[PDB]
Design a protein around this ligand. Structure first.
Ligand SMILES: *[C@@H]1O[C@H](CO)[C@@H](O[C@@H]2O[C@H](CO)[C@@H](O[C@@H]3O[C@H](CO)[C@@H](O)[C@H](O)[C@@H]3O)[C@H](O)[C@H]2NC(C)=O)[C@H](O)[C@H]1NC(C)=O
Ligand SMILES: *[C@@H]1O[C@H](CO)[C@@H](O[C@@H]2O[C@H](CO)[C@@H](O[C@@H]3O[C@H](CO)[C@@H](O)[C@H](O)[C@@H]3O)[C@H](O)[C@H]2NC(C)=O)[C@H](O)[C@H]1NC(C)=O
Ligand SMILES: *[C@@H]1O[C@H](CO)[C@@H](O[C@@H]2O[C@H](CO)[C@@H](O[C@@H]3O[C@H](CO)[C@@H](O)[C@H](O)[C@@H]3O)[C@H](O)[C@H]2NC(C)=O)[C@H](O)[C@H]1NC(C)=O
Ligand SMILES: *[C@@H]1O[C@H](CO)[C@@H](O[C@@H]2O[C@H](CO)[C@@H](O[C@@H]3O[C@H](CO)[C@@H](O)[C@H](O)[C@@H]3O)[C@H](O)[C@H]2NC(C)=O)[C@H](O)[C@H]1NC(C)=O
Ligand SMILES: *[C@@H]1O[C@H](CO)[C@@H](O[C@@H]2O[C@H](CO)[C@@H](O)[C@H](O)[C@H]2NC(C)=O)[C@H](O)[C@H]1NC(C)=O
Ligand SMILES: *[C@@H]1O[C@H](CO)[C@@H](O[C@@H]2O[C@H](CO)[C@@H](O)[C@H](O)[C@H]2NC(C)=O)[C@H](O)[C@H]1NC(C)=O
Ligand SMILES: *[C@@H]1O[C@H](CO)[C@@H](O)[C@H](O)[C@H]1NC(C)=O
Ligand SMILES: *[C@@H]1O[C@H](CO)[C@@H](O)[C@H](O)[C@H]1NC(C)=O
Ligand SMILES: *[C@@H]1O[C@H](CO)[C@@H](O)[C@H](O)[C@H]1NC(C)=O
Ligand SMILES: *[C@@H]1O[C@H](CO)[C@@H](O)[C@H](O)[C@H]1NC(C)=O
Lengths: 148, 192, 50, 49, 48, 50, 49
């Protein structure tokens, strides 16, 4: 019976060690799940490809057996289009830069629009800020800036 | 020793869970690479013209002048680590001295699912996406953008106005190239 | 041999940008284990049953 | 290698870390799993890394 | 249950069902219950 | 051994005399006396907590 | 021979346990590496250091 008892005790020790390993793995997974819960459901996370794929908007949790399920709502841009662009606009010998958008042109006239959605607008002094002259910036394109 | 195996058969199914654990570990190792590297649905290719706002990326983009499509930095890393490896051969052809002894005791090594060439291809695709598209390729279809504009928008992200880069582009490109060269020299140094 | 993915080439240029004109709202699931089965073992019966 | 018994019963056999030509595993009778033959003179044999 | 035209009926709990679980939660439970060895409801009465 | 003996629904074949379970436990026995197929189940146990 | 078999089996079990622990550590490192790749290569991270 000593032989059998030693064998069974070794088997129990092996099972306990495996359970501890799986407990550590589940602890890490649960910590990650709690972090994702806090950073996606209770708020908006700027960490790219953390709360789903794309630009995260909101996450809805769902209970699951021995786990949790997240419904990550993301903003995915689509239907892009070619656009010739310039880094700066020269109006009166001074360079102009976009406030929070890009400079785009449909081949005839230049426009300023937000970087994540094509919403063209007329170049205006309130849409741009002046910095320096037009001989230090590479690729600057001359164009009028409307003063309202 | 057939009789030893016969008497070991009385020990029950103990090799079953050991084999299962080793197989699970191997699958986990494969999934680690599959998750860390295969994060792009497309293999983007850099354009033939290698001018990006004056920045120099020749040390990190792959070149076709080698049998393995790896960059200079990747080759330096491989040479630095190649002192100890699996063995580079597992076909028993040359094995009639360290791997052979372990193999003769039933201690084999399973080759990774992803070869070094495919990992290099993933890294090249990631480089192409982050150079020709910025962060847009990581959230959908890749959108082309000049590298100067991407760096200006990153400066805007760190709280620096765009005109700073558009006025110091030459200096910033020179600093980046010098830093890349310094990294290459440090990696090529004996101090691993 | 494994296919890493569809080959893609980005129309990079000195003056060329791609501004999306539309968008897609995408909802993706994500499953994460939280806890497993809680178990206890009785040595006095497992090792020496009755 | 199996596609699942629910789909098909034919399977593919992978011999780990042995050269096909250098190791003519198709010996006549005295091997482990002796009922196995898999000579595969018609079906091709692919040597992988 | 009007939130800017959005629809949340598939994730909000339904009071009609005795167990306050949403439709998606019910689907998850039914998918997982195909293999459930955690029969805590069993006791010493299991002598059949 | 020790356990609770109860009537069994097992359909023992005439040559079959001992029942067993998944793990080498004779959960069913045949009476050496007047024939009666019998089940063997260890009597109630469990953990004690305060 | 049973003593020798028990010793060898215990050594193999200890090796497997060490391999499992190292695999858990490597998995944690790989998860961190994947997170860093996603948050720094695929985008710009405002996290300090
Ligand atoms: C690039 O975009 C600009 C601005 O959207 C386009 O210019 C626009 O061209 C249309 C052509 O029909 C003009 O519409 C016309 O407006 C006059 C009044 O000015 C009206 O009487 C006509 O019946 C007609 O509706 C529009 O005014 C004009 N806008 C501007 C600001 O100039 C240009 O055509 C676009 N180019 C390409 C290649 O797409
Ligand atoms: C981007 O950086 C790379 C590496 O710093 C530049 O390639 C380097 O080009 C210089 C010459 O412009 C090479 O120096 C000479 O190379 C020859 C041939 O190897 C050698 O015989 C000479 O003694 C001298 O060292 C240098 O080797 C070369 N380095 C590499 C790794 O190819 C590249 O020109 C840069 N591109 C731009 C656009 O700045
Ligand atoms: C931006 O993308 C959305 C979504 O793809 C576009 O909305 C879609 O517009 C089309 C046509 O306007 C809709 O097609 C419809 O199909 C029905 C099928 O019977 C037909 O009867 C209609 O006459 C129409 O053709 C489609 O349903 C609609 N999608 C959604 C989700 O509402 C939108 O037009 C795009 N905008 C731009 C500026 O590209
Ligand atoms: C929000 O989404 C839910 C999804 O459950 C919508 O409820 C479901 O809407 C569908 C389509 O109208 C219903 O199917 C129809 O039901 C009628 C009456 O039973 C039947 O005659 C039709 O042949 C068809 O099957 C469905 O019954 C209804 N409920 C459920 C549980 O699926 C709901 O309309 C959406 N909008 C709002 C504002 O809640
Ligand atoms: C954009 O237009 C302006 C003026 O419309 C150009 O400015 C010229 O600058 C040179 C530099 O010495 C002068 O010799 C010219 O006389 C200027 N033009 C005029 C009309 O006075 C500017 O060069 C243009 N940008 C580009 C890239 O050609
Ligand atoms: C983008 O602009 C760069 C500016 O450097 C171009 O690179 C130069 O192009 C000229 C064109 O004849 C060559 O002579 C030069 O050798 C190129 N290099 C340098 C350092 O000047 C590049 O060709 C442009 N690309 C496109 C697509 O227009
Ligand atoms: C933009 O134009 C280039 C060349 O004409 C082309 O290769 C690319 O696909 C175009 N981009 C889009 C979004 O159509
Ligand atoms: C076998 O596969 C079919 C689909 O090809 C599926 O409908 C069926 O449920 C499967 N059966 C089992 C037992 O998995
Ligand atoms: C197998 O052996 C043949 C003949 O010796 C040789 O040509 C071939 O390269 C070998 N394959 C290996 C070692 O993978
Ligand atoms: C003796 O055992 C036999 C076993 O078949 C049984 O049939 C018989 O009834 C028993 N008689 C008594 C008196 O126990």
């Amino acid at each position: 019976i000593d032989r059998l008892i030693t064998g069974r005790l070794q088997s129990l020790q092996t099972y306990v060690t495996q359970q501890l390993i799986r407990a550590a793995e589940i602890r890490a997974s649960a910590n990650l799940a709690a972090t994702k819960m806090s950073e996606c459901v209770l708020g908006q996370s700027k960490r790219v490809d953390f709360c789903g794929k794309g630009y995260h908007l909101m996450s809805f949790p769902q209970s699951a057996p021995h786990g949790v399920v997240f419904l990550h709502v993301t903003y995915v841009p689509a239907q892009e289009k070619n656009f010739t662009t310039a880094p700066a606009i020269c109006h009166d010998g001074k360079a102009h830069f976009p406030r929070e958008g890009v400079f785009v042109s449909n081949g005839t006239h230049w426009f300023v629009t937000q970087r994540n959605f094509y919403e063209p607008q007329i170049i205006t002094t309130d849409n741009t800020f002046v910095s320096g002259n037009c001989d230090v910036v590479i690729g600057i394109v001359n164009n009028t800036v409307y003063d309202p | 020793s057939t009789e030893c195996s016969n008497l070991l058969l009385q020990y029950g199914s103990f090799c079953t869970q050991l084999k299962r654990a080793l197989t699970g570990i191997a699958v986990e190792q494969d999934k680690n690479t599959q998750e860390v590297f295969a994060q792009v649905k497309q293999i983007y290719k850099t354009p033939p013209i290698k001018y990006f706002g004056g920045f120099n990326f020749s040390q990190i983009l792959p070149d076709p002048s080698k049998p393995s499509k790896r960059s200079f930095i990747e080759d330096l890393l491989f040479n630095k680590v190649t002192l100890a490896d699996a063995g580079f051969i597992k076909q028993y052809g040359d094995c009639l001295d360290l791997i052979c002894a372990q193999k003769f005791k039933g201690l084999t090594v399973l080759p990774p699912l992803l070869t070094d060439e495919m990992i290099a291809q993933y890294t090249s695709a990631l480089l192409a996406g982050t150079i020709t598209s910025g962060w847009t390729f990581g959230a959908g279809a890749a959108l082309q953008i000049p590298f100067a504009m991407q760096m200006a928008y990153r400066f805007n992200g760190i709280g620096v106005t765009q005109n700073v880069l558009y006025e110091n582009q030459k200096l910033i490109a020179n600093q980046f190239n010098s830093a890349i060269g310094k990294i290459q020299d440090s990696l090529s140094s004996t101090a691993s | 041999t494994m296919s890493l993915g569809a080959e893609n080439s980005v129309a990079y240029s000195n003056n060329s940008i791609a501004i999306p004109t539309n968008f897609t709202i995408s909802v993706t699931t994500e499953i994460l284990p939280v806890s497993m089965t809680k178990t206890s073992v009785d040595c006095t019966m497992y090792i020496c049953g009755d | 290698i199996t596609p699942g018994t629910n789909t098909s019963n034919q399977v593919a056999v992978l011999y780990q870390g042995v050269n096909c030509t250098e190791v003519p595993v198709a010996i006549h009778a005295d091997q482990l799993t002796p009922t196995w033959r898999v000579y595969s003179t018609g079906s091709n044999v692919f040597q992988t890394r | 249950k009007y939130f800017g035209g959005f629809n949340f009926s598939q994730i909000l709990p339904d009071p009609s069902k005795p167990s306050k679980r949403s439709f998606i939660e019910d689907l998850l439970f039914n998918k997982v219950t195909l293999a459930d060895a955690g029969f805590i409801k069993q006791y010493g009465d299991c002598l059949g | 051994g020790t356990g609770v003996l109860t009537e069994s629904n097992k359909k023992f074949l005439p040559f079959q005399q001992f029942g067993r379970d998944i793990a080498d436990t004779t959960d069913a026995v045949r009476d050496p006396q007047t024939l009666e197929i019998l089940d063997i189940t260890p009597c109630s146990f469990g953990g004690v907590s305060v």
